[PDB]
Amino acid sequence: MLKMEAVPLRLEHRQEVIDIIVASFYNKADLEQWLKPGVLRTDYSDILNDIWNVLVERDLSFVVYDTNTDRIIGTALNFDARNEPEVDIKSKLLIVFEFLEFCEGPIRDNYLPKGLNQILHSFMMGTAEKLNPRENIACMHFMEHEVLRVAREKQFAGIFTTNTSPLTQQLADVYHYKTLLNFQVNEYVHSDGSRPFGDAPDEQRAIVHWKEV
Numbered sequence: 001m002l003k004m005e006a007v008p009l010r011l012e013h014r015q016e017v018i019d020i021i022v023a024s025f026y027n028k029a030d031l032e033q034w035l036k037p038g039v040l041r042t043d044y045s046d047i048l049n050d051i052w053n054v055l056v057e058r059d060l061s062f063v064v065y066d067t068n069t070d071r072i073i074g075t076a077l078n079f080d081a082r083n084e085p086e087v088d089i090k091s092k093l094l095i096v097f098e099f100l101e102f103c104e105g106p107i108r109d110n111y112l113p114k115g116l117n118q119i120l121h122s123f124m125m126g127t128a129e130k131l132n133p134r135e136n137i138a139c140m141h142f143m144e145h146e147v148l149r150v151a152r153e154k155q156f157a158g159i160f161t162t163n164t165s166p167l168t169q170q171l172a173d174v175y176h177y178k179t180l181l182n183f184q185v186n187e188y189v190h191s192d193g194s195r196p197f198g199d200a201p202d203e204q205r206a207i208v209h210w211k212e213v
């Protein structure tokens with residue numbers, strides 16, 4: 001059985017976390033696949049490197065170790081939704097985060113509690129490529145169990161996230177997240193009038209989830 005341990009994010013974890021996040025969102029990503037081409041492996045390392053110190057300082061993120069190998073197999077990058085770093089993303093990933101803000105912004109700032117230390121934004125969650133289905137399913141449950149524990153320990157009012165893959169969306173629903181938006185990603189219009197995910201099927205959703213803790 002997979003034996004896992006959730007360790008808070010340390011500064012030395014940068015390259016291990018970047019590898020996992022690139023693996024989970026490069027050509028495997030449900031939104032990034034439609035921005036092909038022009039999205040390189042380094043675009044997510046660039047974002048993570050720009051926010052790495054603040055991400056570790058906020059002490060809201062953790063990595064998941066396989067205690068049998070003492071290697072990181074998963075990570076949950078979290079921020080206070082009302083206290084996130086300012087990112088000038090100079091890649092095509094700007095459309096992704098502008099789309100996520102398009103999904104989150106209106107709901108966050110109008111229907112979610114006001115003030116800091118209220119909204120725990122589970123904005124990124126990744127697992128290692130080597131994980132087989134069982135290891136991945138088990139690691140996803142472990143990270144969900146831990147973001148709740150971190151949310152309660154850090155005294156947040158609830159967990160807030162936009163789930164962009166069918167697996168994370170289903171996990172959120174069986175974990176009793178409330179659905180606050182079920183948006184069809186091929187209907188989102190970029191600033192230039194185009195639909196960056198217009199080639200995605202109608203069935204691909206960006207679901208904004210929220211569970212009070």
Ligand SMILES: NCCC(=O)NCCc1cnc[nH]1
Nearest residue numbers: 122123124125161162164168
């Ligand atoms: N509870 C899961 C949160 C998560 O990992 N969401 C990823 C959304 C995303 C896609 N591309 C950039 N961000």
